[PDB]
Ligand binder design. Structure first.
Ligand SMILES: CCCCCCCCCCCCCCCCCC(=O)O[C@@H](COC(=O)CCCCCCCCCCCCCCC)COP(=O)(O)OC[C@H](O)CO
Ligand SMILES: CCCCCCCCCCCCCCCCCC(=O)O[C@@H](COC(=O)CCCCCCCCCCCCCCC)COP(=O)(O)OC[C@H](O)CO
Ligand SMILES: CC(C)CCC[C@@H](C)[C@H]1CC[C@H]2[C@@H]3CC=C4C[C@@H](OC(=O)CCC(=O)O)CC[C@]4(C)[C@H]3CC[C@]12C
Ligand SMILES: CC(C)CCC[C@@H](C)[C@H]1CC[C@H]2[C@@H]3CC=C4C[C@@H](OC(=O)CCC(=O)O)CC[C@]4(C)[C@H]3CC[C@]12C
Ligand SMILES: CC(C)CCC[C@@H](C)[C@H]1CC[C@H]2[C@@H]3CC=C4C[C@@H](OC(=O)CCC(=O)O)CC[C@]4(C)[C@H]3CC[C@]12C
Ligand SMILES: CC(C)CCC[C@@H](C)[C@H]1CC[C@H]2[C@@H]3CC=C4C[C@@H](OC(=O)CCC(=O)O)CC[C@]4(C)[C@H]3CC[C@]12C
Ligand SMILES: CC(C)CCC[C@@H](C)[C@H]1CC[C@H]2[C@@H]3CC=C4C[C@@H](OC(=O)CCC(=O)O)CC[C@]4(C)[C@H]3CC[C@]12C
Ligand SMILES: CC(C)CCC[C@@H](C)[C@H]1CC[C@H]2[C@@H]3CC=C4C[C@@H](OC(=O)CCC(=O)O)CC[C@]4(C)[C@H]3CC[C@]12C
Ligand SMILES: CC(C)CCC[C@@H](C)[C@H]1CC[C@H]2[C@@H]3CC=C4C[C@@H](OC(=O)CCC(=O)O)CC[C@]4(C)[C@H]3CC[C@]12C
Ligand SMILES: CC(C)CCC[C@@H](C)[C@H]1CC[C@H]2[C@@H]3CC=C4C[C@@H](OC(=O)CCC(=O)O)CC[C@]4(C)[C@H]3CC[C@]12C
Ligand SMILES: CC(C)CCC[C@@H](C)[C@H]1CC[C@H]2[C@@H]3CC=C4C[C@@H](OC(=O)CCC(=O)O)CC[C@]4(C)[C@H]3CC[C@]12C
Ligand SMILES: CC(C)CCC[C@@H](C)[C@H]1CC[C@H]2[C@@H]3CC=C4C[C@@H](OC(=O)CCC(=O)O)CC[C@]4(C)[C@H]3CC[C@]12C
Ligand SMILES: CC(C)CCC[C@@H](C)[C@H]1CC[C@H]2[C@@H]3CC=C4C[C@@H](OC(=O)CCC(=O)O)CC[C@]4(C)[C@H]3CC[C@]12C
Ligand SMILES: CC(C)CCC[C@@H](C)[C@H]1CC[C@H]2[C@@H]3CC=C4C[C@@H](OC(=O)CCC(=O)O)CC[C@]4(C)[C@H]3CC[C@]12C
Ligand SMILES: *[C@@H]1O[C@H](CO)[C@@H](O)[C@H](O)[C@H]1NC(C)=O
Ligand SMILES: *[C@@H]1O[C@H](CO)[C@@H](O)[C@H](O)[C@H]1NC(C)=O
Lengths: 523, 523
């Protein structure tokens, strides 16, 4: 117990005379998240309403492919960072590409540059009379910008977090944990700023001035990272010999094609360090595989709660002061970010010291398990609430309005959703931070970026699997989501059952995760 | 991992050339449980319908006081067993009083002996015309039999289980665990036999022949235990010096009135053995305190599920073959016993070897936690089911009939309750057995009976607290249970919310229990 007090110095003393570097990293993360959320917030609406009037399916497919690219590039971004480059040079290059690609969107917004580009001058004005129509317009430039921005975001997301973490590695895992809590805090702050401001301006001032701001944010991110480069000196990996380790992994896998790995490696030219790293990689892959369902349910719940909310009473006299023409459809997502913003400081300053006081959770795996339990509880809460709403819709209905679509909602206040999102926030502040800490901590010192990329790739796989599941339950045979052929008319569909299904899926996952967690520590 | 295979001999080899003693103990346990459940199954109905027509409140109060006495006597029964007597002699004496007291009821059933006793000859026939009426009749004899039987059951329940466990103590905790699995199996088998057979005979043949059988069961229990006494020789504690240990606990508590206990004890005449036992007692008391809410929710769910079932469609063509005049109201309780009967063999023969194979749960506390999680899941399932039933009652209703009361039920098959009871059974086969194993294992070798009695007393405390809670939510101000002024009309009350409340109470308990469990192992 007394040794815990000895470690108390590291916790408070983590941010020793090096706070500037950590601040720079956090600021860069904030700016990049703000830009990313600004891009993804209303991309569908921008495409649909733009003079290049695509079909809703086309825009949805574009966004889905963009997100998939963001998930896919991450392991490759980590490979690039750890091989043939350093980490910092990788961040700089990725952010340069990020800015270059994202630049395109505001030009497309500006009518003069819009006409100058695409060599099409497509101004069919959607519903305006037109002699037939073409397919997705402005395809070359739009796709090019999308691929550039997606690759940039994937590479930065894979490379920055281990870069920041290894910054304070001089201290202990307690210091790393504190850094990670504040990292997630900054991420959420950027998400809030973007989703609130930029969405308000885009949906209520203009796209031309709306898409301009994210470009500025990414530019400032570039400048701040570049300036901090001089004072970082954060034990830069300078990965040039790291190139060798990546090729050796194949050589270890060559033995498979040619503790089985350990026995053959010792005799051959497989000096023990590489054997240990490959063994670690094998050990960790199962853990991400086991987290896949957690990502599935997480992303599915995140998507579903928004449609649930859209059909509850919108409060606050509909913002009587400064009447909200076209109330933006992003603050609904921002709710969870608000809750995490409130929670994280309390956690970091009170709970973690308390738990570390006596003997409590010293490992991240247990924290992920706790988060999963909280997710399950939240899913049940949401199911119950949606059940009551469904019984409450059979009576009269109120014609509310969000964006420019006349939703149908029940006479139930949106605040009733508070317990769900609260449990979600608790689950996130446990799980997400524990998972990032685990990914950084377990990976061999040579290829941390690669393992972080793999982590994010598996998260993307889970998101895609969840989307597939949502499509599956929509089949007529099941009939849970049959009238969901548009923005949404959940009133006619049984979403409550879906929440319970997620709870079951999450519940089973927790038990499965516990088994693997136990096995991992033993070995 | 290989040491697990070494322990495999104990698991299979637990029942070495000593199977006769364990068989005798299990048979005695089965007979005693059968008698106890036969007594408690329709005591209220027997009193209300007997020529000594009490009021429903009077009979309910009588049963409640009887159960409370059963819970209260347990620590005192353990004290008696461990001091001034041995365990076997305590069992014999307790069963003798058990039989003596229980004998009364069949005489009261027999009209000739009924008239001979009570010196009252109360034959007012309930609804038959009567010039006024008196209070609870046959009070002296009925109360005397009830107190005798309650004290007997408390003492046997406290004394037998550690007696059986220490029988196979030559082997390891794996052997003890196997014994406890089969102990619970026998308990459930006896419960099934009683609740089915004896309840059918009582409610469908006659009380005179119905209450005779439990007397026979307790008599055979006495005889089998007496006969096995010769071959038991199960390292009988022969507690005569154990008397000293109990008085010293006060002396350790005298230091409090005169590791604080350890420091003063070493210097004084408090040889370290007693210091260790008192320290252990202090450590364990918190654990029972922490389990109190688990007992609360367990007993509350057990009671509530029956009323839930009573309003679902009664299946099986109402037992078309041999039409069930006055379908008994005990098989509804017997459902859970059936499920545990099916589960326990599978657990014992498959799951426990599998878990012990690699590295999995080696401690009972974790098993109790798992059971609690399963209870929470079952509570949520029941809440959802009751919610759907409540929405399904608003339409037409069906007048079924159980006992002789015209219940109102919804057009929903009773089988829908299967998942609830399945999860309950899983939770029981984990928790209950783990808890018995813990109580026996942690207690100092001198006073195991006392700690088992304390365990059962805390279980009773939890049951009483749960009853108080159910009364509480019935208040008009809350209105969840307002029309429940009789056998039950939950159709007009919101039972579903109550199930969720238990889930929350259970959910919080699990987190609390985990903290204490962790602290216990550390110390
Ligand atoms: C290792 C990976 C395993 C798979 C993991 C993915 C998720 C598995 C769970 C998927 C659950 C599917 C839906 C629930 C299972 C029962 C089928 C069902 O939904 O029953 C409906 C009844 O539908 C049917 O009977 C149609 C059956 C279609 C066949 C496909 C579904 C069966 C399951 C297929 C997947 C396999 C799952 C195995 C169990 C894990 C009930 O809806 P309802 O009609 O009562 O709705 C209310 C109202 O009346 C509107 O209709
Ligand atoms: C360390 C020990 C702590 C205590 C542990 C015991 C259990 C604690 C939890 C007890 C829960 C009580 C009921 C739920 C709390 C909110 C009050 C409530 O039930 O609200 C009702 C509304 O009732 C009220 O507003 C009356 C309030 C009465 C005051 C007493 C209840 C408050 C809580 C008292 C106990 C303290 C609990 C603190 C929280 C843990 C809702 O029912 P309804 O009227 O909407 O029902 C449907 C239909 O409309 C029929 O009416
Ligand atoms: C939610 C739906 C869409 C399913 C999602 C995929 C699951 C079926 C995956 C997720 C986690 C996976 C498990 C993760 C880890 C392992 C350990 C693995 O065994 C090892 O230790 C690998 C090395 C060896 O072969 O010895 C065997 C497969 C298994 C149980 C996996 C089986 C398949 C699981 C359950
Ligand atoms: C760690 C502890 C808190 C246990 C873990 C589980 C709890 C967080 C769960 C158990 C029961 C759940 C509750 C069950 C039912 C409801 C009612 C539900 O509200 C409605 O459906 C209607 C509201 C109205 O209009 O009055 C909101 C969620 C809530 C509070 C749930 C919130 C989450 C709770 C407390
Ligand atoms: C903050 C956490 C820890 C407590 C649980 C969540 C709260 C945010 C809930 C609990 C009580 C709820 C309130 C209780 C009662 C109502 C009445 C409710 O009105 C109706 O049901 C009728 C609607 C109409 O006619 O306008 C509107 C929401 C409101 C204020 C609820 C808003 C959300 C509250 C504050
Ligand atoms: C390669 C093997 C080992 C399988 C694992 C690869 C995954 C990346 C696959 C498996 C299932 C796939 C999903 C199956 C079904 C769909 C539904 C599909 O949705 C639609 O196009 C219909 C609805 C709409 O139009 O929006 C979108 C792709 C998605 C999520 C797929 C994305 C890619 C997934 C997750
Ligand atoms: C552990 C995981 C992988 C499997 C368990 C997932 C459950 C949450 C699913 C599986 C089957 C589902 C049930 C299948 C059928 C129905 C009937 C459905 O409609 C009715 O009530 C009428 C049905 C009829 O008319 O027969 C209501 C939901 C319910 C109970 C579903 C609720 C959600 C359940 C329990
Ligand atoms: C270890 C795994 C299985 C996760 C732990 C939790 C599960 C056991 C829970 C999650 C969701 C629950 C289900 C949610 C909803 C339902 C529907 C419910 O039935 C109804 O509401 C109506 C049934 C009908 O008439 O169709 C019966 C319980 C059940 C299957 C529940 C059973 C228990 C489940 C599977
Ligand atoms: C009774 C039958 C029908 C259930 C079939 C499924 C079982 C095989 C599952 C249900 C719950 C599972 C358990 C859920 C959680 C855990 C916790 C985990 O225990 C730990 O080691 C926790 C950490 C520690 O002990 O320090 C090991 C796996 C285990 C026991 C699981 C083992 C497999 C179990 C028993
Ligand atoms: C469900 C409702 C009716 C409440 C039921 C009673 C609870 C309030 C009890 C059950 C478990 C109890 C806890 C069990 C054990 C302890 C440890 C105890 O601290 C010790 O270790 C005692 C020795 C010391 O004083 O140092 C302090 C009280 C506490 C937290 C208890 C506080 C009160 C609790 C939560
Ligand atoms: C065994 C476990 C692992 C699976 C889940 C629990 C089962 C016991 C459930 C699942 C499907 C259920 C059946 C699905 C559909 C129905 C129709 C249902 O009929 C109605 O809802 C209408 C009633 C009428 O009109 O008579 C009667 C119950 C029954 C047979 C259910 C009985 C209970 C079943 C077998
Ligand atoms: C002594 C101090 C430390 C409190 C702990 C002692 C417990 C044994 C007490 C606390 C609350 C009591 C309960 C509070 C309220 C009631 C309701 C009461 O029910 C009625 O008489 C009304 C309903 C009916 O007539 O059936 C029965 C006793 C009971 C369960 C009590 C039984 C004894 C309890 C559990
Ligand atoms: C962790 C433990 C100790 C506390 C949490 C227990 C919950 C399961 C309780 C506390 C408050 C309860 C809620 C209080 C009020 C209501 C309103 C009640 O009635 C209505 O739907 C109308 C209410 C209105 O008109 O305002 C429905 C159940 C609900 C949500 C209750 C469901 C069960 C809740 C969430
Ligand atoms: C974020 C705020 C608003 C939540 C306030 C309540 C917390 C203080 C609770 C919520 C969940 C609780 C946890 C639930 C379960 C556990 C498991 C337990 O961990 C173990 O030691 C498990 C066994 C092992 O590690 O081997 C220690 C207590 C802990 C972390 C609890 C500590 C207290 C926590 C964090
Ligand atoms: C629709 O036509 C108007 C008037 O000609 C023009 O100003 C506007 O840009 C067109 N809209 C789009 C989306 O191209
Ligand atoms: C009611 O009266 C009948 C006929 O006199 C008698 O046989 C019966 O025992 C009485 N019932 C009771 C419960 O005493």
């Amino acid at each position: 117990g007394a040794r815990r007090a000895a470690a108390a110095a590291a916790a408070a003393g983590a941010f020793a005379g090096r706070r500037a570097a950590c601040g720079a990293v956090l600021l860069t993360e904030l700016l990049e998240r703000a830009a990313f959320y600004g891009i993804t917030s209303n991309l569908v609406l921008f495409l649909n309403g733009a003079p290049f009037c695509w079909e809703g399916a086309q825009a949805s497919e574009a966004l889905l492919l963009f997100m998939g690219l963001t998930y896919l590039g991450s392991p490759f971004g980590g490979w690039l960072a750890d091989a043939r480059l350093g980490r910092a040079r990788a961040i700089l290059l990725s952010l340069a590409l990020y800015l270059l690609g994202m630049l395109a969107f505001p030009l497309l917004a500006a009518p003069a540059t819009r006409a100058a580009l695409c060599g099409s001058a497509r101004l069919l004005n959607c519903t305006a009379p037109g002699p037939d129509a073409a397919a997705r317009c402005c395809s070359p430039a739009t796709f090019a910008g999308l691929v550039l921005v997606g690759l940039g975001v994937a590479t930065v997301k894979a490379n920055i977090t281990p870069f920041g973490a290894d910054q304070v590695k001089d201290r202990g895992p307690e210091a790393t944990r504190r850094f990670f809590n504040w990292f997630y805090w900054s991420i959420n702050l950027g998400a809030i700023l973007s989703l609130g401001g930029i969405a308000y301006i885009q949906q209520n001032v203009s796209f031309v001035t709306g898409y301009a701001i994210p470009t500025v944010c990414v530019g400032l991110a570039f400048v701040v990272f570049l300036c901090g480069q001089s004072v970082f000196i954060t034990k830069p990996p300078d990965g040039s010999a790291f190139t060798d380790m990546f090729k050796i992994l194949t050589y270890s896998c060559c033995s498979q094609k040619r503790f089985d790995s350990c026995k053959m490696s010792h005799g051959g030219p497989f000096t023990e360090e590489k054997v240990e790293d490959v063994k670690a990689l094998v050990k960790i892959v199962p853990v991400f595989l086991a987290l896949i369902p957690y990502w599935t349910v997480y992303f599915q719940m995140q998507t579903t709660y928004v449609l649930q909310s859209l059909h509850l009473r919108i409060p606050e006299i509909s913002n009587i002061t400064t009447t909200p023409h076209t109330l933006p459809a992003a603050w609904l997502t921002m709710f969870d970010a608000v809750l995490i913003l409130l929670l994280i400081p309390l956690k970091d300053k009170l709970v973690d010291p308390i738990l570390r006081r006596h003997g409590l959770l010293p490992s991240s795996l247990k924290r992920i398990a706790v988060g999963m339990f909280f997710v399950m509880c939240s899913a049940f809460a949401a199911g119950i609430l949606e059940s009551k709403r469904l019984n409450l819709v059979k009576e009269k209905t109120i014609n509310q309005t969000i964006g420019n679509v006349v939703y149908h909602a029940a006479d139930l206040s949106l605040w009733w959703q508070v317990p769900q999102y609260l449990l979600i926030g608790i689950s996130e502040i446990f799980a997400s931070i524990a998972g990032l800490e685990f990914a950084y901590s377990a990976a061999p010192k040579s290829m941390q970026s690669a393992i972080m990329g793999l982590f994010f790739f598996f998260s993307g796989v889970g998101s895609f699997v969840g989307s597939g599941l949502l499509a599956l339950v929509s089949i007529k045979a099941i009939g849970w989501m049959s009238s969901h052929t548009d923005f949404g008319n959940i009133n006619g569909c049984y979403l409550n059952y879906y929440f319970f299904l997620l709870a079951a899926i999450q519940g089973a996952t927790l038990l499965l995760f516990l088994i693997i967690s136990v096995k991992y520590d033993h070995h």
